[model samples]
Target: PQCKEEEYPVGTECCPKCSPGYRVKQACGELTGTVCVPCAPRTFSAHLNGLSKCLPCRPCDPAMGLVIRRDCSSTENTECGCDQGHFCVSEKGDDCVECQPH
Candidate 1:
Protein backbone atom coordinates (compact mmCIF):
# COMPACT_ATOMS: atom_id res chain seq x y z
CA PRO A 1 0.00 0.00 0.00
CA GLN A 2 1.00 3.70 -0.25
CA CYS A 3 -0.04 7.10 0.91
CA LYS A 4 -2.28 9.14 -1.33
CA GLU A 5 -0.61 11.97 -3.24
CA GLU A 6 -2.65 14.51 -1.30
CA GLU A 7 -1.34 13.24 2.04
CA TYR A 8 2.11 14.84 1.76
CA PRO A 9 3.78 17.71 -0.04
CA VAL A 10 7.33 18.20 -1.21
CA GLY A 11 9.85 18.29 1.68
CA THR A 12 7.31 16.84 4.06
CA GLU A 13 8.73 14.81 6.94
CA CYS A 14 8.60 11.10 6.44
CA CYS A 15 9.57 8.39 8.82
CA PRO A 16 10.75 4.89 8.09
CA LYS A 17 10.66 4.84 4.33
CA CYS A 18 10.73 1.48 2.58
CA SER A 19 12.02 -1.33 4.72
CA PRO A 20 12.26 -5.05 4.12
CA GLY A 21 8.88 -6.80 4.09
CA TYR A 22 7.29 -3.36 4.38
CA ARG A 23 6.07 -0.84 1.85
CA VAL A 24 7.62 2.58 1.48
CA LYS A 25 5.51 5.67 2.04
CA GLN A 26 3.60 6.72 -1.03
CA ALA A 27 4.33 10.43 -1.04
CA CYS A 28 6.35 9.62 -4.14
CA GLY A 29 9.23 11.95 -4.78
CA GLU A 30 11.89 11.29 -7.40
CA LEU A 31 14.74 12.66 -5.33
CA THR A 32 17.48 10.94 -7.26
CA GLY A 33 21.14 11.96 -6.69
CA THR A 34 19.96 14.70 -4.34
CA VAL A 35 20.62 14.55 -0.62
CA CYS A 36 18.24 12.24 1.25
CA VAL A 37 17.92 12.35 4.98
CA PRO A 38 17.53 9.04 6.76
CA CYS A 39 14.22 8.13 8.37
CA ALA A 40 14.01 7.66 12.10
CA PRO A 41 12.60 4.56 13.78
CA ARG A 42 8.87 3.70 13.83
CA THR A 43 8.23 5.83 10.76
CA PHE A 44 8.27 5.51 6.97
CA SER A 45 7.80 7.26 3.64
CA ALA A 46 7.30 6.01 0.16
CA HIS A 47 7.41 7.97 -3.12
CA LEU A 48 9.64 10.59 -1.56
CA ASN A 49 7.08 12.42 0.50
CA GLY A 50 9.54 15.30 0.53
CA LEU A 51 12.03 17.23 2.70
CA SER A 52 10.24 16.55 5.95
CA LYS A 53 11.98 14.40 8.54
CA CYS A 54 11.24 10.77 7.89
CA LEU A 55 10.35 8.44 10.70
CA PRO A 56 12.85 5.82 11.70
CA CYS A 57 12.58 2.41 10.10
CA ARG A 58 11.61 -0.36 12.46
CA PRO A 59 13.91 -3.35 12.77
CA CYS A 60 12.58 -6.65 11.55
CA ASP A 61 12.73 -9.41 14.08
CA PRO A 62 12.45 -13.07 13.02
CA ALA A 63 8.90 -12.73 14.34
CA MET A 64 7.85 -10.96 11.11
CA GLY A 65 7.48 -14.38 9.56
CA LEU A 66 9.55 -15.21 6.43
CA VAL A 67 11.96 -12.46 5.34
CA ILE A 68 14.52 -12.15 2.56
CA ARG A 69 18.24 -12.59 3.20
CA ARG A 70 19.11 -8.93 2.80
CA ASP A 71 21.16 -6.57 4.93
CA CYS A 72 18.79 -4.46 7.00
CA SER A 73 19.73 -0.89 7.80
CA SER A 74 18.85 0.73 11.07
CA THR A 75 16.41 3.16 9.46
CA GLU A 76 16.20 2.17 5.85
CA ASN A 77 16.07 -0.83 3.56
CA THR A 78 18.61 -3.37 4.84
CA GLU A 79 19.45 -6.57 6.70
CA CYS A 80 18.78 -9.62 4.60
CA GLY A 81 18.23 -12.59 6.84
CA CYS A 82 16.30 -15.84 6.88
CA ASP A 83 13.54 -16.58 9.36
CA GLN A 84 13.84 -19.28 11.98
CA GLY A 85 13.73 -22.80 10.59
CA HIS A 86 15.06 -21.34 7.32
CA PHE A 87 18.63 -21.40 6.07
CA CYS A 88 20.78 -19.53 3.58
CA VAL A 89 20.66 -22.04 0.78
CA SER A 90 22.96 -20.01 -1.46
CA GLU A 91 24.10 -16.49 -0.74
CA LYS A 92 23.64 -13.89 1.97
CA GLY A 93 20.52 -12.07 0.77
CA ASP A 94 16.84 -12.41 0.25
CA ASP A 95 17.36 -13.41 -3.37
CA CYS A 96 18.40 -16.99 -2.74
CA VAL A 97 16.29 -18.66 -0.06
CA GLU A 98 15.21 -22.03 1.29
CA CYS A 99 13.34 -22.97 4.43
CA GLN A 100 14.95 -25.15 7.07
CA PRO A 101 13.28 -28.44 7.87
CA HIS A 102 10.92 -28.38 10.82
Candidate 2:
Protein backbone atom coordinates (compact mmCIF):
# COMPACT_ATOMS: atom_id res chain seq x y z
CA PRO A 1 0.00 0.00 0.00
CA GLN A 2 1.01 3.57 -0.44
CA CYS A 3 2.24 5.66 2.46
CA LYS A 4 -0.06 8.37 3.73
CA GLU A 5 0.95 11.98 3.19
CA GLU A 6 1.78 12.14 6.90
CA GLU A 7 3.76 8.90 6.84
CA TYR A 8 6.32 10.44 4.51
CA PRO A 9 7.68 13.60 6.02
CA VAL A 10 9.04 16.42 3.91
CA GLY A 11 12.63 16.18 2.53
CA THR A 12 12.90 12.47 3.18
CA GLU A 13 12.81 9.23 1.16
CA CYS A 14 9.56 7.85 2.50
CA CYS A 15 7.43 4.99 1.21
CA PRO A 16 5.25 2.13 2.30
CA LYS A 17 7.94 -0.45 1.70
CA CYS A 18 10.60 -1.78 -0.65
CA SER A 19 11.13 -5.23 -2.16
CA PRO A 20 13.70 -7.69 -0.83
CA GLY A 21 17.34 -6.99 -1.68
CA TYR A 22 16.31 -3.58 -2.93
CA ARG A 23 16.54 -0.01 -1.63
CA VAL A 24 14.39 3.09 -1.82
CA LYS A 25 16.57 5.17 -4.10
CA GLN A 26 13.71 7.46 -5.00
CA ALA A 27 10.55 8.27 -3.13
CA CYS A 28 7.36 6.48 -4.06
CA GLY A 29 5.56 8.39 -6.75
CA GLU A 30 2.03 8.57 -5.41
CA LEU A 31 1.56 4.82 -5.63
CA THR A 32 1.21 1.81 -3.43
CA GLY A 33 4.42 -0.04 -2.56
CA THR A 34 7.03 2.54 -3.36
CA VAL A 35 9.65 1.83 -5.97
CA CYS A 36 12.66 -0.03 -4.61
CA VAL A 37 15.88 -0.86 -6.41
CA PRO A 38 18.19 -3.83 -5.93
CA CYS A 39 21.67 -3.60 -4.49
CA ALA A 40 24.63 -3.34 -6.85
CA PRO A 41 26.88 -6.26 -7.80
CA ARG A 42 29.47 -7.57 -5.29
CA THR A 43 27.03 -6.42 -2.68
CA PHE A 44 23.99 -8.10 -1.13
CA SER A 45 20.82 -6.50 0.16
CA ALA A 46 19.88 -9.02 2.86
CA HIS A 47 16.80 -7.18 4.04
CA LEU A 48 13.84 -8.87 2.48
CA ASN A 49 10.27 -9.02 3.77
CA GLY A 50 9.44 -5.41 3.13
CA LEU A 51 12.73 -3.82 4.14
CA SER A 52 13.80 -0.22 3.74
CA LYS A 53 17.44 -0.86 2.86
CA CYS A 54 19.63 -3.80 1.83
CA LEU A 55 22.32 -5.28 4.07
CA PRO A 56 25.91 -6.06 3.18
CA CYS A 57 26.69 -9.72 3.71
CA ARG A 58 29.95 -10.58 5.38
CA PRO A 59 32.26 -13.48 4.61
CA CYS A 60 32.14 -16.62 6.69
CA ASP A 61 34.99 -17.60 8.99
CA PRO A 62 38.13 -18.50 7.02
CA ALA A 63 38.57 -21.60 9.15
CA MET A 64 35.37 -22.88 7.57
CA GLY A 65 37.30 -22.97 4.27
CA LEU A 66 34.32 -21.75 2.23
CA VAL A 67 32.71 -18.35 1.89
CA ILE A 68 29.27 -17.05 1.09
CA ARG A 69 28.33 -18.37 -2.37
CA ARG A 70 26.46 -15.19 -3.25
CA ASP A 71 24.83 -12.18 -1.75
CA CYS A 72 21.74 -13.15 0.23
CA SER A 73 18.47 -11.25 0.35
CA SER A 74 18.22 -8.13 2.46
CA THR A 75 16.26 -9.70 5.32
CA GLU A 76 16.62 -13.48 5.60
CA ASN A 77 19.96 -13.69 3.82
CA THR A 78 22.29 -16.65 4.29
CA GLU A 79 25.89 -17.80 3.89
CA CYS A 80 28.11 -20.81 4.52
CA GLY A 81 31.58 -21.57 5.87
CA CYS A 82 32.83 -25.12 5.66
CA ASP A 83 36.18 -26.80 6.19
CA GLN A 84 37.90 -29.38 4.01
CA GLY A 85 35.74 -32.29 2.84
CA HIS A 86 32.69 -30.11 3.39
CA PHE A 87 30.64 -27.69 1.32
CA CYS A 88 27.40 -25.71 1.36
CA VAL A 89 24.90 -24.30 -1.12
CA SER A 90 21.21 -23.57 -1.30
CA GLU A 91 18.46 -21.90 -3.30
CA LYS A 92 15.94 -19.34 -2.12
CA GLY A 93 13.91 -20.57 0.87
CA ASP A 94 16.10 -23.70 1.04
CA ASP A 95 17.91 -24.47 4.25
CA CYS A 96 21.71 -24.17 4.29
CA VAL A 97 22.55 -27.77 4.98
CA GLU A 98 25.83 -29.65 4.68
CA CYS A 99 26.70 -31.21 1.28
CA GLN A 100 27.93 -34.76 0.89
CA PRO A 101 31.00 -35.57 -1.14
CA HIS A 102 30.55 -37.23 -4.51
Candidate 3:
Protein backbone atom coordinates (compact mmCIF):
# COMPACT_ATOMS: atom_id res chain seq x y z
CA PRO A 1 0.00 0.00 0.00
CA GLN A 2 3.05 2.23 0.52
CA CYS A 3 5.58 3.08 -2.17
CA LYS A 4 9.34 2.74 -1.57
CA GLU A 5 11.62 5.76 -1.61
CA GLU A 6 12.83 4.81 -5.07
CA GLU A 7 9.31 4.38 -6.42
CA TYR A 8 6.60 6.85 -7.32
CA PRO A 9 2.93 6.47 -6.61
CA VAL A 10 0.57 6.27 -9.57
CA GLY A 11 -3.08 5.96 -8.57
CA THR A 12 -3.17 2.61 -6.78
CA GLU A 13 0.23 1.38 -7.97
CA CYS A 14 3.79 2.09 -7.01
CA CYS A 15 5.90 2.57 -10.13
CA PRO A 16 9.63 1.84 -10.29
CA LYS A 17 11.63 4.99 -10.69
CA CYS A 18 14.08 5.72 -13.48
CA SER A 19 17.76 5.68 -12.54
CA PRO A 20 20.27 8.40 -13.14
CA GLY A 21 20.80 9.12 -16.84
CA TYR A 22 17.26 8.08 -17.67
CA ARG A 23 13.76 9.57 -17.74
CA VAL A 24 10.31 8.07 -17.46
CA LYS A 25 8.89 7.25 -20.87
CA GLN A 26 5.63 5.92 -19.46
CA ALA A 27 4.15 5.65 -16.00
CA CYS A 28 3.26 2.31 -14.50
CA GLY A 29 -0.23 0.95 -15.14
CA GLU A 30 -2.46 -1.74 -13.79
CA LEU A 31 -0.93 -4.34 -16.09
CA THR A 32 2.42 -2.77 -17.02
CA GLY A 33 5.34 -1.39 -15.03
CA THR A 34 7.23 1.85 -15.53
CA VAL A 35 9.03 2.45 -18.81
CA CYS A 36 12.26 4.45 -18.97
CA VAL A 37 14.30 6.20 -21.66
CA PRO A 38 17.88 7.39 -21.80
CA CYS A 39 18.67 11.07 -21.59
CA ALA A 40 19.40 12.86 -24.88
CA PRO A 41 22.75 14.37 -25.75
CA ARG A 42 23.75 17.38 -23.66
CA THR A 43 21.21 16.42 -21.02
CA PHE A 44 21.48 14.58 -17.71
CA SER A 45 19.64 13.18 -14.69
CA ALA A 46 21.86 12.99 -11.63
CA HIS A 47 19.37 11.16 -9.43
CA LEU A 48 16.49 8.75 -9.46
CA ASN A 49 13.17 10.20 -10.56
CA GLY A 50 10.00 9.88 -12.61
CA LEU A 51 10.66 12.95 -14.71
CA SER A 52 9.70 13.09 -18.36
CA LYS A 53 12.84 15.02 -19.34
CA CYS A 54 16.42 15.41 -18.10
CA LEU A 55 18.15 18.62 -17.04
CA PRO A 56 20.39 20.53 -19.46
CA CYS A 57 24.19 20.42 -18.99
CA ARG A 58 26.01 23.68 -18.35
CA PRO A 59 28.85 24.92 -20.54
CA CYS A 60 32.21 26.41 -19.72
CA ASP A 61 32.87 29.82 -21.26
CA PRO A 62 36.38 30.48 -22.57
CA ALA A 63 35.89 34.26 -22.42
CA MET A 64 35.19 33.88 -18.72
CA GLY A 65 38.41 31.92 -18.17
CA LEU A 66 36.57 28.73 -17.55
CA VAL A 67 37.56 25.38 -19.06
CA ILE A 68 36.04 21.96 -18.93
CA ARG A 69 37.44 19.79 -16.13
CA ARG A 70 35.03 17.00 -16.77
CA ASP A 71 32.76 16.56 -19.78
CA CYS A 72 29.04 16.24 -19.25
CA SER A 73 27.48 12.81 -19.40
CA SER A 74 23.99 11.36 -19.29
CA THR A 75 24.38 10.67 -15.53
CA GLU A 76 26.38 13.71 -14.46
CA ASN A 77 26.63 17.45 -15.09
CA THR A 78 29.62 19.34 -16.49
CA GLU A 79 32.53 20.30 -14.22
CA CYS A 80 34.12 23.67 -15.03
CA GLY A 81 37.37 25.02 -13.62
CA CYS A 82 39.54 28.04 -14.10
CA ASP A 83 41.93 28.13 -17.07
CA GLN A 84 45.68 28.43 -16.79
CA GLY A 85 47.01 31.39 -14.79
CA HIS A 86 43.52 32.00 -13.39
CA PHE A 87 41.78 31.01 -10.16
CA CYS A 88 38.15 30.48 -9.49
CA VAL A 89 36.55 33.52 -7.89
CA SER A 90 33.21 31.88 -7.33
CA GLU A 91 31.89 28.38 -7.68
CA LYS A 92 28.88 26.22 -7.00
CA GLY A 93 28.90 22.45 -6.92
CA ASP A 94 31.47 21.37 -9.50
CA ASP A 95 31.12 24.50 -11.63
CA CYS A 96 33.19 27.65 -11.55
CA VAL A 97 30.90 30.65 -11.53
CA GLU A 98 33.68 33.18 -12.03
CA CYS A 99 37.44 33.25 -12.50
CA GLN A 100 40.22 35.74 -11.81
CA PRO A 101 43.90 36.01 -12.68
CA HIS A 102 46.43 34.87 -10.07
Candidate 4:
Protein backbone atom coordinates (compact mmCIF):
# COMPACT_ATOMS: atom_id res chain seq x y z
CA PRO A 1 0.00 0.00 0.00
CA GLN A 2 1.11 3.57 -0.69
CA CYS A 3 1.67 5.78 2.31
CA LYS A 4 0.34 9.31 2.21
CA GLU A 5 2.58 12.35 2.55
CA GLU A 6 1.88 12.48 6.29
CA GLU A 7 2.54 8.79 6.80
CA TYR A 8 5.48 6.43 6.52
CA PRO A 9 5.75 2.72 5.78
CA VAL A 10 6.10 0.29 8.65
CA GLY A 11 6.41 -3.18 7.17
CA THR A 12 3.18 -3.30 5.16
CA GLU A 13 1.36 -0.75 7.31
CA CYS A 14 1.30 2.97 6.82
CA CYS A 15 1.88 4.82 10.07
CA PRO A 16 1.25 8.49 10.71
CA LYS A 17 4.37 10.60 11.08
CA CYS A 18 5.12 12.90 13.98
CA SER A 19 4.80 16.64 13.49
CA PRO A 20 7.70 19.05 13.66
CA GLY A 21 9.35 19.48 17.08
CA TYR A 22 8.60 15.86 17.95
CA ARG A 23 10.01 12.40 17.30
CA VAL A 24 8.55 8.94 17.18
CA LYS A 25 8.52 7.11 20.47
CA GLN A 26 6.82 4.15 18.88
CA ALA A 27 5.58 3.33 15.42
CA CYS A 28 1.99 2.27 14.86
CA GLY A 29 1.26 -1.40 15.35
CA GLU A 30 -1.59 -3.86 15.61
CA LEU A 31 -3.05 -2.35 18.77
CA THR A 32 -1.44 1.09 18.90
CA GLY A 33 -1.18 4.20 16.81
CA THR A 34 2.00 6.20 16.40
CA VAL A 35 3.44 7.69 19.59
CA CYS A 36 5.44 10.91 19.57
CA VAL A 37 7.40 12.85 22.11
CA PRO A 38 8.83 16.36 22.23
CA CYS A 39 12.43 16.82 21.15
CA ALA A 40 14.90 17.35 23.97
CA PRO A 41 16.99 20.51 24.34
CA ARG A 42 19.73 20.84 21.73
CA THR A 43 17.69 18.70 19.36
CA PHE A 44 15.04 19.48 16.76
CA SER A 45 12.77 18.14 14.04
CA ALA A 46 12.14 20.61 11.24
CA HIS A 47 9.41 18.67 9.50
CA LEU A 48 6.98 15.80 9.92
CA ASN A 49 8.87 12.57 10.24
CA GLY A 50 9.07 9.00 11.48
CA LEU A 51 12.48 9.62 13.04
CA SER A 52 13.07 7.95 16.38
CA LYS A 53 15.41 10.74 17.39
CA CYS A 54 15.70 14.40 16.48
CA LEU A 55 18.72 15.95 14.79
CA PRO A 56 21.35 17.59 16.96
CA CYS A 57 21.44 21.39 16.95
CA ARG A 58 24.47 23.21 15.56
CA PRO A 59 26.68 25.23 17.87
CA CYS A 60 28.01 28.71 17.19
CA ASP A 61 31.52 28.19 18.49
CA PRO A 62 33.84 31.16 18.90
CA ALA A 63 36.74 28.79 18.37
CA MET A 64 35.32 28.21 14.89
CA GLY A 65 34.76 31.95 14.37
CA LEU A 66 31.04 31.43 14.24
CA VAL A 67 28.23 33.28 15.94
CA ILE A 68 24.60 32.53 16.45
CA ARG A 69 22.28 34.08 13.92
CA ARG A 70 19.27 32.23 15.35
CA ASP A 71 18.79 30.21 18.51
CA CYS A 72 17.77 26.56 18.38
CA SER A 73 14.19 25.61 19.09
CA SER A 74 12.39 22.30 19.29
CA THR A 75 11.21 22.79 15.71
CA GLU A 76 14.31 24.43 14.25
CA ASN A 77 18.07 23.96 14.47
CA THR A 78 20.44 26.77 15.42
CA GLU A 79 21.56 29.08 12.65
CA CYS A 80 25.24 30.04 12.61
CA GLY A 81 27.30 32.54 10.66
CA CYS A 82 30.82 33.90 10.60
CA ASP A 83 31.78 36.10 13.54
CA GLN A 84 32.37 39.82 13.31
CA GLY A 85 35.17 40.84 10.93
CA HIS A 86 35.29 37.19 9.75
CA PHE A 87 34.00 35.61 6.58
CA CYS A 88 32.92 32.05 6.04
CA VAL A 89 35.41 29.62 4.53
CA SER A 90 32.97 26.75 4.36
CA GLU A 91 29.31 26.50 5.24
CA LYS A 92 26.48 24.02 4.90
CA GLY A 93 22.89 24.63 5.82
CA ASP A 94 22.93 26.74 8.99
CA ASP A 95 26.43 25.82 10.07
CA CYS A 96 29.71 27.59 9.33
CA VAL A 97 32.54 25.07 9.53
CA GLU A 98 35.40 27.43 8.85
CA CYS A 99 36.09 31.16 8.76
CA GLN A 100 38.78 33.68 7.91
CA PRO A 101 39.30 37.16 9.30
CA HIS A 102 38.85 40.13 6.94
Q: Which one is best on TM-score? A: 3
The digit string of per-residue lDDT tens for model 3 on 19-95 reads 99999999988788889999999999999988889999999998899999999999999999999999998989878
- Compute each candidate's TM-score over C-alphas: 0.29, 0.46, 0.87, 0.84
Model 1, CA-based lDDT = 0.43
Candidate 2 clashing pairs? Answer: 45-74, 46-73, 46-74, 46-75, 47-74, 47-75, 48-74, 48-75, 64-82
Off by over 4 Å in 1: 1-46, 63-68, 73-81, 87-101
lDDT of 4 by residue, 1-102 (tens): 489899999888999999999999999998998999999899999999999999999778899888888899999989888888999999787677878899
State the TM-score for model 1. Answer: 0.29
lDDT of each: 0.43, 0.50, 0.92, 0.91
- Backbone Cα, N, C clashes tallied per candidate: 38, 9, 0, 0
Worst 10-residue lDDT window for candidate 1 reads 14-23
Query: Which lDDT value does model 3 have at 22?
Result: 98
Q: State the lDDT at 27 in candidate 2.
A: 60
- Model 3, 62: alpha-carbon shift in Å? 2.5
The stretch of ten residues in a row with the least summed lDDT in candidate 3 is: 1-10
TM-score of 2: 0.46
State which candidate has the highest lDDT: 3
Per-residue alpha-carbon lDDT of candidate 2 for residues 1-102, written as tens digits (9 for 90 to 100): 243533443245454545556666656555554566776544455433234456655555555355555435544445654545665553234434344433
Sort by lDDT, best first: 3, 4, 2, 1
